[PDB]
Amino acid sequence: TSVRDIAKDGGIFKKILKEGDKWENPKDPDEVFVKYEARLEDGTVVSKSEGVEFTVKDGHLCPALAKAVKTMKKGEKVLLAVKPQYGFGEMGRPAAGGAVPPNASLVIDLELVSWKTVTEIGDDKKILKKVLKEXEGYERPNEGAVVTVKITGKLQDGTVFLKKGHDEQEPFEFKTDEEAVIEGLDRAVLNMKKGEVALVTIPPEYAYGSTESKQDAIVPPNSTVIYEVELVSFVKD
Structure with missing residues (x-):
């Protein structure tokens, strides 16, 4: 043995x-x-x-x-x-x-x-992307891709402060690497596959930073935030 x-x-x-x-x-x-x-x-x-x-x-x-x-x-x-x-x-x-x-x-x-599986993203390694559901096969948004995603943003207690792009909402699409979204979501999505569902932990300096963000609840300044993200589809640049 x-x-x-x-x-x-x-x-x-x-x-x-x-x-x-x-x-x-x-x-x-x-x-x-x-x-x-x-x-x-x-x-x-x-x-x-x-x-x-x-x-x-x-x-x-x-x-x-x-x-x-x-x-x-x-x-x-x-x-x-x-x-x-x-x-x-x-x-x-x-x-x-x-x-x-x-x-x-x-x-x-x-x-x-x-x-x-959790990937550490960024030069820093401070952004954690935890895969909840694997996507399909190989190939990921590149810089300038236009991506469609569903996202929910939560505080580390469980408070949901943001929901965007879900089926009951208008679709949410952004172009990556244009500051269309907080830096932690921008970098995460470059690391995801189509259909992937991930949990992204993002410290404040890559999210809302030192000022409060008035959302469904206020994100207190200096909060680490968790986004659940589904990358629906993308068209690479």
Whole structure:
């Protein structure tokens, strides 16, 4: 059976119990959906989830999960043998939700169910585009394309402040790279395929900046905003 020293440390050994599908593994920015059960060597269950999502680079539970999933395929099911270095280290963890002793090793059953691919856009990497529905095939708006999109703009709490281009509205078309839209939407759309539906997280300097925007609700100055965007079609320049 396959067993990887994924940290190249003996720090984490991943043992494949069920092979996953395809060739793709998730990457740091992606949002993965996993289930797991994490135990001490004596079988004590310290944490468990029948399904939780996280951004790979932000981690979940302890360094070993994010390290592990970046090596896993869709549907892969594994048992991780984890040293305290990649677990809870010298501090261990107090009980509440399995206390983990200082310097304890863990044993973790982990299944990668699925994930959403997130692209970092801009020189900055500060614009995140998370694909909710893949578009069709290859080819993307270029600078000067005229694009038709449906968009909804929300604050990070869930407040919808903008809706444009939906089927019950007039169609919304813009030309890219003309400042026809906030810079984060302009750059996102150059990175999308026809039919793609994406969630775009956009910091203030690439959205409404330091002045309030009076929309369905006021976007407070300095807000990061999330656009859900569907690229309906485009005609490249």
